[PDB]
Design an enzyme around this catalytic site. Structure first.
Site, PDB file in Angstrom:
ATOM      1  N   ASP A 139     -33.397  90.596 -18.489  1.00  0.00           N
ATOM      2  CA  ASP A 139     -32.627  91.785 -18.390  1.00  0.00           C
ATOM      3  C   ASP A 139     -33.437  92.900 -19.055  1.00  0.00           C
ATOM      4  O   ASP A 139     -32.506  93.641 -19.163  1.00  0.00           O
ATOM      5  CB  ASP A 139     -31.247  91.355 -18.863  1.00  0.00           C
ATOM      6  CG  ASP A 139     -30.052  92.163 -18.385  1.00  0.00           C
ATOM      7  OD1 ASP A 139     -29.088  92.673 -19.057  1.00  0.00           O
ATOM      8  OD2 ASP A 139     -30.221  92.971 -17.329  1.00  0.00           O
ATOM      9  N   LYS A 142     -36.670  96.274 -14.632  1.00  0.00           N
ATOM     10  CA  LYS A 142     -36.702  95.406 -13.514  1.00  0.00           C
ATOM     11  C   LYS A 142     -38.000  95.149 -12.774  1.00  0.00           C
ATOM     12  O   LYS A 142     -38.262  94.212 -12.292  1.00  0.00           O
ATOM     13  CB  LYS A 142     -35.953  96.039 -12.375  1.00  0.00           C
ATOM     14  CG  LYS A 142     -34.354  96.419 -12.675  1.00  0.00           C
ATOM     15  CD  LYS A 142     -33.909  94.955 -13.472  1.00  0.00           C
ATOM     16  CE  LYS A 142     -32.927  95.290 -14.609  1.00  0.00           C
ATOM     17  NZ  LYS A 142     -32.610  94.218 -15.129  1.00  0.00           N
ATOM     18  N   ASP A 167     -30.810  88.964 -14.258  1.00  0.00           N
ATOM     19  CA  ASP A 167     -29.662  90.207 -14.174  1.00  0.00           C
ATOM     20  C   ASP A 167     -30.193  91.173 -13.250  1.00  0.00           C
ATOM     21  O   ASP A 167     -31.319  91.319 -13.125  1.00  0.00           O
ATOM     22  CB  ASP A 167     -29.258  90.276 -15.431  1.00  0.00           C
ATOM     23  CG  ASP A 167     -27.822  91.442 -15.485  1.00  0.00           C
ATOM     24  OD1 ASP A 167     -27.228  91.327 -14.372  1.00  0.00           O
ATOM     25  OD2 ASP A 167     -27.813  92.245 -15.999  1.00  0.00           O
ATOM     26  N   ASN A 168     -29.081  91.679 -12.522  1.00  0.00           N
ATOM     27  CA  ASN A 168     -29.249  92.604 -11.602  1.00  0.00           C
ATOM     28  C   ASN A 168     -30.158  92.440 -10.342  1.00  0.00           C
ATOM     29  O   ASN A 168     -30.974  93.309  -9.885  1.00  0.00           O
ATOM     30  CB  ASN A 168     -30.136  93.755 -12.249  1.00  0.00           C
ATOM     31  CG  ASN A 168     -28.958  94.118 -13.389  1.00  0.00           C
ATOM     32  OD1 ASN A 168     -29.462  94.030 -14.768  1.00  0.00           O
ATOM     33  ND2 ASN A 168     -27.818  94.589 -13.397  1.00  0.00           N
ATOM     34  N   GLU A 197     -21.599  95.675 -13.539  1.00  0.00           N
ATOM     35  CA  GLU A 197     -20.653  95.836 -14.953  1.00  0.00           C
ATOM     36  C   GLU A 197     -19.944  97.168 -14.734  1.00  0.00           C
ATOM     37  O   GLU A 197     -20.470  98.366 -14.438  1.00  0.00           O
ATOM     38  CB  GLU A 197     -21.631  95.973 -16.065  1.00  0.00           C
ATOM     39  CG  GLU A 197     -22.904  97.117 -16.211  1.00  0.00           C
ATOM     40  CD  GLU A 197     -24.040  96.385 -15.638  1.00  0.00           C
ATOM     41  OE1 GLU A 197     -24.059  95.351 -14.930  1.00  0.00           O
ATOM     42  OE2 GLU A 197     -25.232  96.880 -16.297  1.00  0.00           O
TER      43      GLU A 197
HETATM   44  C1  SAM Z   1     -30.451  96.014 -19.222  1.00  0.00           C
HETATM   45  S1  SAM Z   1     -30.727  96.692 -20.943  1.00  0.00           S
HETATM   46  C2  SAM Z   1     -30.473  95.058 -21.766  1.00  0.00           C
HETATM   47  C3  SAM Z   1     -28.873  94.681 -21.843  1.00  0.00           C
HETATM   48  C4  SAM Z   1     -28.475  93.510 -22.636  1.00  0.00           C
HETATM   49  N1  SAM Z   1     -29.478  92.138 -22.139  1.00  0.00           N
HETATM   50  C5  SAM Z   1     -27.075  93.300 -22.416  1.00  0.00           C
HETATM   51  O1  SAM Z   1     -26.776  92.716 -21.204  1.00  0.00           O
HETATM   52  O2  SAM Z   1     -26.332  93.400 -23.164  1.00  0.00           O
HETATM   53  C6  SAM Z   1     -32.514  96.592 -20.792  1.00  0.00           C
HETATM   54  C7  SAM Z   1     -33.001  96.939 -22.171  1.00  0.00           C
HETATM   55  O3  SAM Z   1     -34.466  96.111 -22.359  1.00  0.00           O
HETATM   56  C8  SAM Z   1     -35.277  96.976 -23.066  1.00  0.00           C
HETATM   57  N2  SAM Z   1     -36.462  96.720 -22.546  1.00  0.00           N
HETATM   58  C9  SAM Z   1     -36.942  97.345 -21.509  1.00  0.00           C
HETATM   59  N3  SAM Z   1     -38.199  96.763 -21.122  1.00  0.00           N
HETATM   60  C10 SAM Z   1     -38.540  95.981 -22.253  1.00  0.00           C
HETATM   61  C11 SAM Z   1     -39.657  94.987 -22.401  1.00  0.00           C
HETATM   62  N4  SAM Z   1     -40.749  95.286 -21.550  1.00  0.00           N
HETATM   63  N5  SAM Z   1     -39.735  94.365 -23.438  1.00  0.00           N
HETATM   64  C12 SAM Z   1     -38.752  94.274 -24.259  1.00  0.00           C
HETATM   65  N6  SAM Z   1     -37.700  95.238 -24.103  1.00  0.00           N
HETATM   66  C13 SAM Z   1     -37.444  95.727 -23.048  1.00  0.00           C
HETATM   67  C14 SAM Z   1     -34.989  98.333 -23.024  1.00  0.00           C
HETATM   68  O4  SAM Z   1     -35.187  98.953 -24.155  1.00  0.00           O
HETATM   69  C15 SAM Z   1     -33.354  98.288 -22.639  1.00  0.00           C
HETATM   70  O5  SAM Z   1     -32.520  98.475 -23.806  1.00  0.00           O
HETATM   71  O1  DNC Z   2     -28.343 101.324 -14.160  1.00  0.00           O
HETATM   72  N1  DNC Z   2     -28.144 100.299 -13.739  1.00  0.00           N
HETATM   73  O2  DNC Z   2     -27.735  99.935 -12.457  1.00  0.00           O
HETATM   74  C1  DNC Z   2     -28.643  98.925 -14.657  1.00  0.00           C
HETATM   75  C2  DNC Z   2     -27.760  97.873 -14.477  1.00  0.00           C
HETATM   76  C3  DNC Z   2     -27.984  96.823 -15.422  1.00  0.00           C
HETATM   77  O3  DNC Z   2     -27.208  95.669 -15.445  1.00  0.00           O
HETATM   78  C4  DNC Z   2     -29.318  96.719 -16.000  1.00  0.00           C
HETATM   79  O4  DNC Z   2     -29.545  95.807 -16.782  1.00  0.00           O
HETATM   80  C5  DNC Z   2     -30.266  97.960 -15.846  1.00  0.00           C
HETATM   81  N2  DNC Z   2     -31.500  98.045 -16.624  1.00  0.00           N
HETATM   82  O5  DNC Z   2     -31.947  97.043 -16.916  1.00  0.00           O
HETATM   83  O6  DNC Z   2     -31.900  99.236 -17.021  1.00  0.00           O
HETATM   84  C6  DNC Z   2     -29.695  99.134 -15.150  1.00  0.00           C
HETATM   85 MG    MG Z   3     -28.523  93.987 -16.761  1.00  0.00          MG
END
Ligand code: SAM
Ligand code: DNC
Ligand code: MG
Length: 212
Positions: A139, A142, A167-168, A197
């Protein structure tokens, strides 16, 4: 005062300490009715609950922690003595993951790895005493799904029967990863259609089970 800071502020006020389920509903209603946030959400979360409850994994890897919503969601369902490691590059997100975790009382089974997933994956085995991962939750960004999947395979972190949950896969989409896992004879894939979400948009979780 950041967005991720108000969300901890909400939990710290509305959620009851030591109750992982409570925190979850706090984060959900705040983001649901005040600010949008990239948490998995409750609806795909209920699927991860169903999938974790089934495969009941001992060691589980998360990629991208953010505010710890999914780290709480997974770790409140782990059997005694099970480990969850959560990789998060952003120091600010990683600081709030820990707090959130502490509040939920889940600090003892969740280990934060602060850094870029690509840099720490090759160090996972030695530094953190790791043989093979029973489950990986993807997650993070992407574009890193596929790279990190081959990276996990390269370092021999993938075991026959390892469950990759992604996810996603519909929005925003992980097309190169989806293309690789569905087409590869190393991965046996199932799709679970859900909803993005805090929205009426069709998203979904892809489960990909490594075969060797
Ligand atoms: C979609 S959010 C994670 C949401 C969390 N898993 C949840 O569902 O509650 C993406 C997060 O991954 C982190 N991220 C993005 N690229 C990453 C990487 N290459 N390695 C570790 N973390 C990363 C970003 O800082 C961001 O906070
Ligand atoms: O903005 N989005 O649509 C999303 C949604 C998501 O559920 C994500 O995890 C995300 N992301 O990894 O940055 C971005
Ligand atoms: Mg996500």
């Amino acid at each position: 005062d950041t967005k991720e800071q108000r969300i901890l502020n909400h939990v710290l006020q509305h959620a009851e300490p030591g109750n992982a389920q409570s925190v979850l509903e706090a984060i959900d209603t705040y983001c649901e009715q005040k600010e949008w946030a990239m948490n998995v959400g409750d609806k795909k979360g209920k699927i991860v609950d169903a999938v974790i409850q089934e495969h009941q994994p001992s060691v589980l890897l998360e990629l991208g922690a953010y505010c710890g919503y999914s780290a709480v969601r997974m770790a409140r369902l782990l059997s005694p003595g099970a480990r969850l490691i959560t990789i998060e590059i952003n120091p600010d997100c990683a600081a709030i993951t820990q707090r959130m975790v502490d509040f939920a009382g889940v600090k003892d089974k969740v280990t934060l790895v602060v850094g870029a997933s690509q840099d720490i994956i090759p160090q996972l085995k030695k530094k953190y005493d790791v043989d093979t991962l029973d489950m990986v939750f993807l997650d993070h960004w992407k574009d890193r799904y596929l790279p990190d999947t081959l990276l996990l395979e390269e370092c021999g972190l993938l075991r026959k029967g390892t469950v990759l949950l992604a996810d996603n896969v519909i929005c925003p989409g992980a097309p190169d990863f989806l293309a690789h896992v569905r087409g590869s004879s190393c991965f046996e894939c199932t799709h679970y259609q859900s909803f993005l979400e805090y929205r009426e948009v069709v998203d979904g979780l892809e489960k990909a089970i490594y075969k060797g």
